[PDB]
Design a protein around this ligand. Structure first.
Ligand SMILES: Nc1nc2c(ncn2[C@@H]2O[C@H](COP(=O)(O)OP(=O)(O)O)[C@@H](O)[C@H]2O)c(=O)[nH]1
Ligand SMILES: [Mg+2]
Length: 319
């Protein structure tokens, strides 16, 4: 997948937890499903879908607290993903202790992030439910008084790598809620355009813009209006022809997610400057095709698709 623009400061997803909690396994699930979104050089840092991922272990019996690391690592955190092995009840108190330490550190250096707890290794159809619940409740007993004092509202997920949709849904749903989807898609488009030297990129659903990136902001209104008119003249389920908005040529791919009897029609559009046409247009088309396939897949996790409701004002307020 595409690199992030190194002159830019992406938002971070922190994937934290005790050693053995399952985080590398969770990461690899995402990477096997969405390699097209990942810049792949055990890795502790990688770029994914317009975000920077930080995957760090804590605790255990080795000489365990090596995070107390430069301050830059706790800056720009927007998503705090914390993995808790609920089979390992004896380590739950240790897990909660690091959780609280890391939340306090993150609050010191990052201003506005949200918390997602992955209650992990809840393997499908298998006994163990009493222990799983006891571990989850013990974790919450340890962490909620502090969370409540700090006025967080964490989200709880229930995951297992042996049921990979649970992991894919937990990891992707936070990025694609109505409050975060526009920024997520916009940052993903920025990375996509940077990686192959495109001028701008837009994503639409039902002809409404849900993500946008422009290397020149002066043209946003003009291109957005022209794209709206172009899309409103297109029929369902045909290739979208290229067109020119001088000096740009714009290429569009369409994709669809059905929810019951209803379709959500999406469009992915990117622009090149005709006065500097890339030497390898095939590379751009092949990249767009692969990206579109994976965008369709990850957007199955958006609140839009999960509820079957396009809430324009909520998406615009999320910005
Ligand atoms: N039963 C079960 N084992 C898992 C699960 N996820 C990870 N593991 C196992 O837990 C061990 C630690 O996983 P790992 O991904 O290396 O954890 P990390 O130390 O947090 O990176 C490994 O043996 C994994 O195969 C899961 O969902 N269910
Ligand atoms: Mg690991």
């Amino acid at each position: 997948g595409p690199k992030l623009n190194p002159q830019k400061n992406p938002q971070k997803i922190a994937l934290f937890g005790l050693n053995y909690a399952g985080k590398t396994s969770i990461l690899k699930t995402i990477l096997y499903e969405f390699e097209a979104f990942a810049h792949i050089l055990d890795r502790t840092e990688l770029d994914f879908f317009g975000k920077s991922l930080l995957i760090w272990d804590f605790g255990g019996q080795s000489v365990r607290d090596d995070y107390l690391q430069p301050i830059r690592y706790f800056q720009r955190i927007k998503y705090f993903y914390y993995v808790v092995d609920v089979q390992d009840i004896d380590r739950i108190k240790e897990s909660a202790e690091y959780f609280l330490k890391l939340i306090k550190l993150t609050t010191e250096y990052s201003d506005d992030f949200k918390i997602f707890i992955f209650f992990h290794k809840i393997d499908p159809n298998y006994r163990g439910k009493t222990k799983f619940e006891e571990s989850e409740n013990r974790f919450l007993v340890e962490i909620l008084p502090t969370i409540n004092e700090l006025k967080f509202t964490p989200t709880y997920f229930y995951t297992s790598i042996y049921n990979p949709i649970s992991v894919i849904s937990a990891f992707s749903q936070p990025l694609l809620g109505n409050e975060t989807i526009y920024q997520t898609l916009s940052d993903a488009l920025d990375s996509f355009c940077f990686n192959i030297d495109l001028e701008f990129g837009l994503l639409f659903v039902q002809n409404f813009i849900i993500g946008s990136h422009f290397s020149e902001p002066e043209i946003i209104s003009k291109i957005s209006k022209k794209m709206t008119m172009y899309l409103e003249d297109l029929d369902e389920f045909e290739d979208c022809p290229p067109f020119t908005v001088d000096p740009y040529k714009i290429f569009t791919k369409n994709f669809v997610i059905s929810v019951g009897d209803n379709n959500f029609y999406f469009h992915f559009s990117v622009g090149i400057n005709i006065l500097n046409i890339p030497d390898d247009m095939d590379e751009i088309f092949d990249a767009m095709d692969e990206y579109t396939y994976n965008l369709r897949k990850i957007l199955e996790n958006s609140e839009l698709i999960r509820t079957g409701e396009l809430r324009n004002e909520e998406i615009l307020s999320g910005i």
